[PDB]
Amino acid sequence: TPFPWNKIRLPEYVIPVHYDLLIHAQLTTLTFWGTTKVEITASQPTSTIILHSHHLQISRATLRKGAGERLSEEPLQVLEHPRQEQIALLAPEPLLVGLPYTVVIHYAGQLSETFHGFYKSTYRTKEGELRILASTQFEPTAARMAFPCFDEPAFKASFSIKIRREPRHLAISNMPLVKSVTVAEGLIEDHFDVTVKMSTYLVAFIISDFESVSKITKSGVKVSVYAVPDKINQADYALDAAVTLLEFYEDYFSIPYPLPKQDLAAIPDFQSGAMENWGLTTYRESALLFDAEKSSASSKLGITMTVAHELAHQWFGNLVTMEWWNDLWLNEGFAKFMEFVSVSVTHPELKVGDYFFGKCFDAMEVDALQSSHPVSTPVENPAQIREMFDDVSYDKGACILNMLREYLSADAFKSGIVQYLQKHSYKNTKNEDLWDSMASIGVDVKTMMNTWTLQKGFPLITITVRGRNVHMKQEHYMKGGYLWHVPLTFITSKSDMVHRFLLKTKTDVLILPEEVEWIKFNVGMNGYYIVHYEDDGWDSLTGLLKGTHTAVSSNDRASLINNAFQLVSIGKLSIEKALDLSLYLKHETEIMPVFQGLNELIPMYKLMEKRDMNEVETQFKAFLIRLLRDLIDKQTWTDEGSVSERMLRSQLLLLACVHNYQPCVQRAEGYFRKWKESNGQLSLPVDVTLAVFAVGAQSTEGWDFLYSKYQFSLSSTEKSQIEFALCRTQNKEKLQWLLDESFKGDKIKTQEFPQILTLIGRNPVGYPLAWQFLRKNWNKLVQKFELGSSSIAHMVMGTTNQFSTRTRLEEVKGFFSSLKENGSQLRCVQQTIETIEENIGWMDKNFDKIRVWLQS
Numbered sequence: 001t002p003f004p005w006n007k008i009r010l011p012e013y014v015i016p017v018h019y020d021l022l023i024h025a026q027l028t029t030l031t032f033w034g035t036t037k038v039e040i041t042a043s044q045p046t047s048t049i050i051l052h053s054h055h056l057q058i059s060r061a062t063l064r065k066g067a068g069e070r071l072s073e074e075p076l077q078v079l080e081h082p083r084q085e086q087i088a089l090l091a092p093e094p095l096l097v098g099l100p101y102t103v104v105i106h107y108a109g110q111l112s113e114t115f116h117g118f119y120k121s122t123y124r125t126k127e128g129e130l131r132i133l134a135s136t137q138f139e140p141t142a143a144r145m146a147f148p149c150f151d152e153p154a155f156k157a158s159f160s161i162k163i164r165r166e167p168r169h170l171a172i173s174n175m176p177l178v179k180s181v182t183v184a185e186g187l188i189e190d191h192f193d194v195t196v197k198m199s200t201y202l203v204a205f206i207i208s209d210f211e212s213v214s215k216i217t218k219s220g221v222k223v224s225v226y227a228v229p230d231k232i233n234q235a236d237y238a239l240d241a242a243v244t245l246l247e248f249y250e251d252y253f254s255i256p257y258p259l260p261k262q263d264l265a266a267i268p269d270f271q272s273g274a275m276e277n278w279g280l281t282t283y284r285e286s287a288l289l290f291d292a293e294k295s296s297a298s299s300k301l302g303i304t305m306t307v308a309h310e311l312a313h314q315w316f317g318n319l320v321t322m323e324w325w326n327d328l329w330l331n332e333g334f335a336k337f338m339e340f341v342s343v344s345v346t347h348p349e350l351k352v353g354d355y356f357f358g359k360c361f362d363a364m365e366v367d368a369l370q371s372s373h374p375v376s377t378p379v380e381n382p383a384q385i386r387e388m389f390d391d392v393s394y395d396k397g398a399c400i401l402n403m404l405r406e407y408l409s410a411d412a413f414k415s416g417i418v419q420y421l422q423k424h425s426y427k428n429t430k431n432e433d434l435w436d437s438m439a440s441i442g443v444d445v446k447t448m449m450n451t452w453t454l455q456k457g458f459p460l461i462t463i464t465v466r467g468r469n470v471h472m473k474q475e476h477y478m479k480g481g482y483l484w485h486v487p488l489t490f491i492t493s494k495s496d497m498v499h500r501f502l503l504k505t506k507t508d509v510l511i512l513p514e515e516v517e518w519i520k521f522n523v524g525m526n527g528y529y530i531v532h533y534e535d536d537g538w539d540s541l542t543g544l545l546k547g548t549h550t551a552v553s554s555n556d557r558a559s560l561i562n563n564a565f566q567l568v569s570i571g572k573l574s575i576e577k578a579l580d581l582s583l584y585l586k587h588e589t590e591i592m593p594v595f596q597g598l599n600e601l602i603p604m605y606k607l608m609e610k611r612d613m614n615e616v617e618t619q620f621k622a623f624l625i626r627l628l629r630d631l632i633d634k635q636t637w638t639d640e641g642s643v644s645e646r647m648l649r650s651q652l653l654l655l656a657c658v659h660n661y662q663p664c665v666q667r668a669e670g671y672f673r674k675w676k677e678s679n680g681q682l683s684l685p686v687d688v689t690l691a692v693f694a695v696g697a698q699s700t701e702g703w704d705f706l707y708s709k710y711q712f713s714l715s716s717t718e719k720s721q722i723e724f725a726l727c728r729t730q731n732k733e734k735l736q737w738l739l740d741e742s743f744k745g746d747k748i749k750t751q752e753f754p755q756i757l758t759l760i761g762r763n764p765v766g767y768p769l770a771w772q773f774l775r776k777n778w779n780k781l782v783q784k785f786e787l788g789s790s791s792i793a794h795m796v797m798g799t800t801n802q803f804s805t806r807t808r809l810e811e812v813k814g815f816f817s818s819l820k821e822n823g824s825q826l827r828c829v830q831q832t833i834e835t836i837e838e839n840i841g842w843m844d845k846n847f848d849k850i851r852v853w854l855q856s
């Protein structure tokens with residue numbers, strides 16, 4: 001019997017309006033049963049209903065028309081197309097156009113052993129008892145694994161969820177609990193209130209023994225944090241942050257949060273960082289739970305930013321949703337950007353605005369490659385859709401929005417946002433909808449923003465100065481007929497006011513009022529472009545950084561460091577001139593230019609570590625330590641100062657210890673010895689813990705001691721610090737053990753496996769083990785994490801993108817091409833191949849130049 005539908009996309013003439021979802025999960029057998037009742041209307045006659053279903057055993061399907069006395073039921077025959085993840089329901093007669101019908105489906109499934117669908121999560125009590133819970137993760141296409149549905153984001157509907165569970169367990173879902181009814185078999189049926197109209201991917205439900213803490217907003221919304229009983233005392237910070245941020249967004253968008261409550265649940269097993277399910281946001285425990293004594297400043301910042309991200313989605317994603325995954329950036333670019341807007345207001349002591357440009361540089365890494373994609377690009381299958389959750393949708397999306405906001409001004413941008421959110425509330429949007437909204441306040445918005453969303457990559461802006469005449473040229477930046485509307489900014493030696501010039505053409509000229517000593521484009525790195533200066537331009541700017549680096553802001557200094565090294569890669573600046581510029585860092589004090597320096601310089605020796613280059617690698621590492629030696633030496637071994645001072649300290653001490661800087665190694669050995677002799681009871685400053693643990697794990701006794709403390713820790717920061725330290729061992733049997741254990745999920749959870757694999761991929765002796773492990777265990781890793789997931793992308797890049805020989809390039813090409821449909825077409829594979837090709841060319845051109853430069 002042939003399947004009566006040949007497309008991946010569903011027919012668009014059968015529309016759902018409301019779902020009634022009844023779910024019973026048996027935690028003892030890992031089996032679940034459901035009854036789905038979906039109210040539908042057909043716009044054209046059909047005897048066939050096509051919908052999504054994946055790994056669900058359908059026992060019965062019926063078609064209802066009317067209610068009570070005037071009720072009719074009809075049996076529905078079921079056909080399956082597993083590859084398209086569809087089912088076809090066959091009625092004995094055609095459906096009458098425009099009349100409401102209810103499709104009733106009874107089914108069963110097994111709780112997923114992955115991190116998606118309706119899945120199993122476990123933890124151990126401090127007494128060592130194993131506890132099992134069931135949670136959901138549906139974005140993008142996994143709602144169809146928990147209940148049959150029209151599983152595309154434009155098929156919005158209301159949802160009335162009912163959960164049957166044991167009296168000893170708690171169930172939570174998107175909406176408040178309205179009633180709990182005693183049913184047969186000693187079960188309780190929880191009835192949750194009907195949701196607002198929303199996408200299937202936002203449905204959520206959890207059956208657990210979680211504890212909770214709550215606080216009410218000024219608008220009367222009940223905000224709650226849920227977590228395992230042993231960790232609920234770490235919920236207070238996120239609870240306070242969530243209340244403040246929810247109030248900020250309501251005030252800012254002038255659109256109230258529409259639900260009576262908002263829950264934030266810390267899940268013991270979670271693949272991504274968090275998920276924005278409407279009324280039930282979910283998080284990795286490390287992304288939500290703060291320990292005032294053991295958590296790092298970076299973890300505290302991470303929690304604040306993640307809560308800000310998920311809450312921004314309540315408007316940008318939930319209330320207004322992209323029509324299709326090709327426009328995922330409308331959700332992700334906005335939520336990423338709003339983290340910075342919201343936290344800059346709510347937590348001005350975190351100084352987050354100063355860190356934003358770092359996201360743009362992250363996007364530029366991928367976007368400089370031929371294998372990048374436009375922000376808005378076609379996608380069809382689930383693996384392609386998952387590939388949209390990447391630095392282009394998130395970081396480039398946020399960066400082009402930041403660039404647009406600076407161009408329009410914050411108030412005109414805000415008016416545009418509010419108009420957009422109001423007009424498209426409970427509906428779906430495409431790119432043109434956003435431009436139309438922004439332009440209704442912005443005459444050039446549509447033409448300009450189409451250049452930034454429909455073309456991959458970014459421009460190189462070349463500056464040539466002839467007296468008062470500033471010549472500008474744009475061209476597509478490509479590693480080794482594109483045209484943008486570029487909102488340029490600049491400052492000069494005569495004016496620190498931010499000047500604006502819209503470059504709509506290949507070339508243009510601006511006439512300065514008077515001649516200047518220097519000009520610097522892309523003020524504060526607020527623009528998604530790079531800049532090259534002709535003639536003595538780079539010598540001049542190098543001179544400025546070396547004489548009066550304070551003449552330009554910390555972010556302007558970071559932008560110069562980054563652009564100089566990006567220009568080496570396209571042969572516009574020599575490696576010697578970029579390295580000469582980096583020498584100014586001997587007097588740098590600020591976190592962003594110091595970190596930008598490390599971001600450009602560390603990858604160079606990471607390439608050398610994987611080659612026969614011991615001498616140059618050692619001299620390069622010695623140069624790096626000598627360059628930052630005064631700054632390293634000034635660091636106190638405490639938790640004193642601002643969040644930026646704490647993060648700078650932690651990374652400087654770790655860098656010094658990793659590269660065997662003796663004053664820091666001897667001090668770290670001392671703290672470790674003292675900490676170990678006290679049986680880990682003595683408190684170490686959190687800021688020095690990474691360095692201290694990395695040093696301590698270099699001995700068998702130290703590694704074993706760290707591992708013994710890991711099993712009992714309730715702190716996410718401490719566990720992450722121990723995992724990092726353990727992965728830095730140069731004992732291959734211990735590195736193999738870490739890969740084996742985290743892969744199995746026994747002693748170390750599988751949610752840690754992608755980071756562990758990358759850390760070992762970066763280990764100077766362990767890198768062959770990580771690449772070999774990925775190849776050997778590929779199928780099981782794909783089954784666990786999914787083809788196209790950001791996790792698989794990070795595992796691919798993390799084990800191969802630091803290779804720089806033709807032999808390594810063929811190993812990568814050969815391996816991934818052998819996978820056929822199970823990974824040969826992954827975008828991350830094309831990206832890593834292109835990265836290795838660039839590494840080969842860069843090393844062949846510059847290795848000897850660096851060798852000579854280091855001797856001089």
Ligand SMILES: C[C@@H]1C[C@H](O)[C@@]2(C)C(C(=O)O)=CCC[C@@H]2[C@@]1(C)CCc1ccoc1
Pocket residue numbers: 594595596598599602651654655658762
């Ligand atoms: C992400 C890095 C990975 C890198 O493999 C690593 C582990 C490193 C090494 O392997 O040599 C030495 C210093 C720390 C560094 C980092 C964690 C931190 C870099 C850093 C800090 C501040 O700005 C950049």
Ligand SMILES: [Zn+2]
Pocket residue numbers: 309313331332335336
């Ligand atoms: Zn998001």
